[PDB]
Amino acid sequence: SLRDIKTRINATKKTSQITKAMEMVSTSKLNRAEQNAKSFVPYMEKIQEVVANVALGAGGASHPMLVSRPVKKTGYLVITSDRGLAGAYNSNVLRLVYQTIQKRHACPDEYAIIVIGRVGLSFFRKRNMPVILDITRLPDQPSFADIKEIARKTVGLFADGTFDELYMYYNHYVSAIQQEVTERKLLPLTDLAENKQRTVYEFEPSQEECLDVLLPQYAESLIYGALLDAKASEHAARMTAMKNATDNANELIRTLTLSYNRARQAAITQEITEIVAGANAL
């Protein structure tokens, strides 16, 4: 009936307005987060190339950050949203890590999960797999000091020897339209190669202690880089998901308006037919 379709049109128009507004604000956070990441990208390029060339000289490959340890337990960092409507951003990465761990070994003792994000923590809790560490509701502009606490804890776990290998499962920003699930080993560190050019540390201190300062600092900076791309790609994923959802809302409103117009015009033409039938009958 006519007054049935109008309520559906009105409610959909309100949801369409909510989705458009959230598209605007996600666009603003996407552009800022990409600029912020590009601000820390020269820091990553500079640090990576100095830490590698310094790390080669008299730093033994048996060093705890570089040498393998026979694998008993592995840590899984998983980076996830704190809020919904993000399309399939969380589901594609939770599902990828869930299948990866279960189909490599579902044994409860070997895996150890570390999750950044409420919907990730919610899925893992229903599954019951343990979460050694957690943090949530990070500011949309994340700063190094915030995630230094968790970064220093997780690397503290690897450095003290409680983990033998470490992984990260972040979505990655390739385009505004489309983004990819990705996986990287965090430690042990094996980008080592010949220097070509050599810059020397101080001669008096044993370089292995200096490595214990500088290489954990790099591993942390690698976590932070991954988090920056994760938050930027989240704001991209929400922007595209909210944009597509607005398109679906608009199409539906069109179809409903066509049916509402047809129903009203049918009612008015019936009314006019009654007026004619009265006018000749009298």
Binding site: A11, K14, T15, I18, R83, G84, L85
Partner: protein, 126 residues
């Protein structure tokens, strides 16, 4: 007049907030609170068939609702909170009802809160 006037404001404010914001899963804290108060409000206003409730025990349930004594209790259990409370209110609190019967007046707030807090000692949550 005192309790029903504020109840109209509460339910109008949540009618609009729920009409749009319920579809999204998570909202602002202050809105999750107002959504909780509206859901409890509609559940506490459900009633049975051919069982009129005297005005004396209506004002005491609406007062318990608006002043926010029902936050601890779950939404499903409320139709039992009412059931077990009206029995308690005929086992204890007869003077409150007597003042309301002829005066048309809300009893002293110290004694009304003492009554509701004692019942909340007796009632067992699922």
């Amino acid at each position: 007049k005192k309790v029903a006037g504020t109840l109209r404001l509460d339910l109008a404010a949540y009618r609009e907030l729920e009409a749009f914001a319920q579809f999204g899963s998570d909202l602002d804290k202050a809105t999750q609170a107002k959504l909780a108060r509206g859901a409890r409000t509609v559940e506490v206003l459900k009633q049975d068939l051919h069982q009129p409730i005297p005005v004396e025990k209506q004002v005491l349930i609406i007062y318990a609702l608006t002043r926010g004594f029902l936050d601890d209790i779950p939404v499903e259990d409320v139709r039992r909170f009412e059931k077990e409370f009206y029995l308690f209110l005929d086992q204890n609190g007869q003077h409150l009802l007597e003042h309301i019967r002829t005066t048309k007046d809300l009893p002293n707030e110290d004694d009304l809160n003492k009554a509701i807090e004692a019942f909340k000692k007796t009632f067992v949550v699922s």
